[PDB]
Design a binder for these strands. Structure first.
Length: 71
DNA sequence: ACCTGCGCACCAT
DNA sequence: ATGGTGCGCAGGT
């Protein structure tokens, strides 16, 4: 889908907005419920966003989080 | 189960 | 100091 990048970035923003860690599990869970795709597909799309440096994967306070690079 | 809301301690700069 | 972050809950669907 052409909207997948926006789906993931909006999900990261929404998890930050409710003060929840944007980890892989919550990102995949929210994309599935909002839009349909299975976690395997969201994992693959997220990896593309990391290679494009649109999303940053960081370790923070002992766990991995994903950051919207535009923010 | 599912979801959102949030105070404030924590962390890099 | 700044100014973003998310634990550990409360509370609703």
């Amino acid at each position: 889908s052409p909207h997948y990048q926006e789906w993931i970035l909006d999900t990261i923003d929404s998890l930050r907005s409710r003060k929840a860690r944007p980890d892989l599990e919550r990102i995949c869970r929210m994309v599935r419920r909002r839009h349909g795709p299975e976690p395997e597909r969201t994992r693959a799309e997220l990896e593309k966003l990391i290679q494009q440096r649109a999303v940053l994967r960081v370790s923070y306070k002992g766990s991995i989080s994903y950051r919207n690079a535009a923010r």
